[model samples]
Target: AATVDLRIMETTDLHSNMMDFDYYKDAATEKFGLVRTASLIEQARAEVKNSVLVDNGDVIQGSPLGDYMAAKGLKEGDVHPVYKAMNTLNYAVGNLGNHEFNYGLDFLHKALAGAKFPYVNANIIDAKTGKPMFTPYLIQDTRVVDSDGQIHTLRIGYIGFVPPQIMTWDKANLNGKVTVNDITETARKYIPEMRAKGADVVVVVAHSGLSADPYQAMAENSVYYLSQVPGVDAIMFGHAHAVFPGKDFANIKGADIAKGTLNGVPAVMPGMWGDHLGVVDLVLNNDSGKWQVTQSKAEARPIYDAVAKKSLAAEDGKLVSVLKADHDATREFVSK
Candidate 1:
């Protein structure tokens, strides 16, 4: 039961900043993307032998790219610019934020069809069936060889959850089609189910962000609320678009943080618009098979530090080149 090196590169609330271009920019406010954080992903991989990249939620429909993807002049099946950016990064899993429902389920399905990785949401259910819509969880079992060439089995389980209140926020697009359950209830139900299905280690990619002020933290705080669940190991939070550096978000009714529980769990949220990268390193127990987050950090991954308020720019020339036809073909639609 020797511990393995697991590193996570978390991006949340992207809101269509793909292509390193924020199409929503007016002459007054130039802002948005995951482009700047791309450097952080590179650096993290360099430091570890085993790593995974994850996105919490709100990846689509915020900036100009999202605007174009939905309301813009794009045709059906035309790849979105933000998705073009996500293609290069090779995300493992991404949660769905409320805005993802803005354009309607069809647009979401269309954008998802373009995504290289699976888009996850455990709390969301089909209104007709009352069952989870997407895959319940993904258990990726891999063999990570050590310096001695001895391979280890890593059972990594990933689940996603969005704000339950999305029903009220984006009612027009979601009404009568989908239903959302509370975050805590969803985690309690899904975490053990994933464990029963053979996941040795579990993690949540939450599209909810961290607290702006701990003492003033509200029930809507994502990470704060979910950490109280019994078997939850680690969580990557998004939505509010804030950053955290080992900040404490104390208490959540029941559940014990003392025994095989996550109370002061290590959670991080990269600031929105691709300004920072969230890094959390987890070390598994050789004896108990539990993950004790060994270390964690969140840092700004700026595109142009000199510009004062510049946004991240796109990279991966090949991806950029591949999408040129798609970009131009769909550049003029109306989102509203």
Candidate 2:
């Protein structure tokens, strides 16, 4: 088999901490920050030459800085401060978490308009158009070098999901503007379509979590069911604020906690606030014009050791500097 090793790195539930400093405590914390995670991201990229980076949402609506920026607003060409920071990392895709809709459609679009990367969400859509609010999915033709020192094009497909419960949660903002669909059902429809569209492998960026509670049409944490979908090659899960492939998920049927998989499909749920990074490595065989995943594994790497009160990663100076102005603004706003 002719193979190329592809690595997928994800940051989830960032909730705005662009810098290593915390606004609420008005102090620096070793716990988490996208700035710190960015450092880890760079290292992860260097570890595997053929890799793609993505954010699992909750990036723009959690912290005081996010609130400040929402109030400040995005003008015609003004990039949201969050996007200004995230743009430097060169992400392949950003999945819209439930909180993204907290600011309303107008602001969400304006905020999205600022990002350099594309965002995807398959479950939520415009009422009038009956189409996804954001791009449903993306098929990126990646020119990657195989392990054997050869060049090949990988048709990597990506689709995203937000819990349908958003309709009830953000009723004020969504009301008649959007329609939410069941997560698993949405995947059932898109996975095959994506494969049919010539995707070599399909990756799901789900802004949901792992839950095998029971099956329901609009269940919020439906990653368990989503994994059962026939064609999903890998899944980037979030919104639970916990890591996968760990003891926390043990005892759940169909979950190989040690392997970080659900129903035989590799998945990762990086901890929230950029405290950890999810890495899913896949070895895909591209032979005779068809690509098939030959092997895969998943893990969540941390940026800090809470017990030791030590920082395992350094803050990304570039990301920190990019948001310094806004960081200052948030500080000033909170003081009053």
Candidate 3:
């Protein structure tokens, strides 16, 4: 009788809000910031024995800081200030969002080059060669200790997906450049492969949403059907900027808002701009010589109470210092 409690933490739709201060307003705001969430991530991990941190995309190109950095551009040996702050927390992996393509491929590549963690996107493919534009999926050998104080390394599969609407939203940037497939089909094709490759757990970091609208090919916010794909143990989703496990999804059949599940599979959709952290705790057992999830739960913990207009978490000063230079420069640039 051995079991391991694995905690998956997620930050999604960040859109480059490195600091708590908003450059446009030229003042600090409790609205949202990665700096604040960074502390929550540390605290959340400390509370759980085994944890994996991931980002659900839209890291770059949203605010004045993003625009300023893109304008100033990254140098040959410099890490984008956002990544510099993000690197402090140590992410397991990250995914792409539609806004990432807003600054063109060159800038996006340069920005991504600075990240300490790897990124994945399975649905996007090269138009010419008919191959994936970037890495499709990645499996990490995570060494974890079970409740009985036994160490075991398990294959934790992390595959990322971005909405196909990117093609239409950024038509000029994507046309003749990339091809994107249906989300459901892509998940069906990849999850089985991950299972066959001995992935004890599979986490889908989807920069999409969960909805019950009639399914169609290339439908955005189609994560609702993804749970039916089988093999996906847990999912971290965003792009709608609304939390799952809320009344918004109560109307969707097969979705349990109270339990934070879509079709009986645990999932979380953290709010945008680093406002919330998605947590999925999976308890796996090895009684049959194979690690399989026996219990699972999900939550979207917020850093601020929107209704109360009160801050729930404090901004970690380390992240502030990490982006201090860039933050000042960005503020000064906007003043001009």
Candidate 4:
């Protein structure tokens, strides 16, 4: 059998920790920041033969840095600092978290305009067309070499969902602009289309969490239920800011919390603010010339290992140099 290994890297709820500076304390910190996670991403990529990077939303609007960028006001041509950082990181796809709408649609639109990658959200629908407000899903084509050295084209599909409660969370900003639907219901409708479109594997970037609740129409934490939705190969989740495959869902029925899997599907929810990087690794084999995932594993890599009582990762020097201007501006903005 011909086999290939693929790795998927995820960052969620970054919340504007670009510089690793805690503006509230006005001091440099090591707790959480993309600057630190950058090192982990590079190391992970170097360890694997093939990989793709993605983000699961809430990248904007948590730290004073985010408020500073919004306060500065984005003009038609100006690039938002957050998107600039993400662009530098080379993310393949992104999803909108509920917090993405905290600054209203106009600001959100201006901010999203700066991303080099596609941002997806399936459940938020346009009130007029009753269809997805943003790009629902994307199929990316890439070639990978098997252990036998023969190359095969992989069609990886990605679909994203945000909490339907966005309507209630940002009601003042969302009313009339968009309508929300259930996450599982939305996934049920799209997974088939993706498979029919030649998707070899499908991943869901869910901005929800893991819960054992039976499928509810508008469930906030629907990871467990979404896993039951046929065709979902892997999942990247957030919104609770808690670590997955950890103790959070250990007691939840049907979740292999230690394995970081939900209903037998590999999944991860890295900690918030870039403190940890979520990773999913898969081994695929060719069955009668058709690609099929044979094994899947997921884990969360932290910048600092508190249990081990020492730092495990460091900030990337190149990234700091790349975003030097924005970092200085953010520092000045919050200090003033």
TM-score computed on alpha carbons, candidate 1? 0.81
Tens digits of lDDT, candidate 4, 1-336 = 789898999999999888787877878778888999988899899997889998999988898778888788888977887877788877889999999999898988888988999888899999988878899999999778788888878899999999999999999999998999999999999999999999998999999988776677999998888889998989999998999888867887767866667778899999899999999998888776777878888999999988777767787887788778988888788777
Descending-lDDT candidate ranking: 3, 4, 2, 1
Could you tell me how far off, in angstroms, the CA of residue 324 lies in candidate 4 after the best superposition?
A: 2.1
Output the better candidate (2/3) by lDDT: 3
lDDT assessment of candidate 2: 0.87
Error of 1 at 58 (Å): 1.3
Angstrom error of the Cα, residue 209, model 4: value is: 0.8
- After superposition, the stretches of candidate 3 with alpha carbons farther than 4 Å from their true spots are 307-309
Estimate, for each residue in 160-256, the C-alpha lDDT of model 3 and write its tens digit: 9989999999999888999799888899999989989889999998999887788888988878878888898999999999987788888988888
CA lDDT of every candidate:
0.65, 0.87, 0.88, 0.88
Clashing pairs in 3: none
Q: After superposition, how far is residue 309 of candidate 3 from its true place, in Å?
A: 4.3
Give the clashing pairs for model 2: none
- The list of candidate 1 runs beyond 4 A from truth reads 22-32, 73-77, 146-149, 211-219, 246-262, 288-336
What is the Cα-based TM-score of model 2? 0.97
User: Which should have the higher TM-score, number 1 or number 2?
Assistant: 2
TM-score of each: 0.81, 0.97, 0.97, 0.97
CA-RMSD of model 4: 1.2
List runs of model 4 lying over 4 Å from the truth.
none
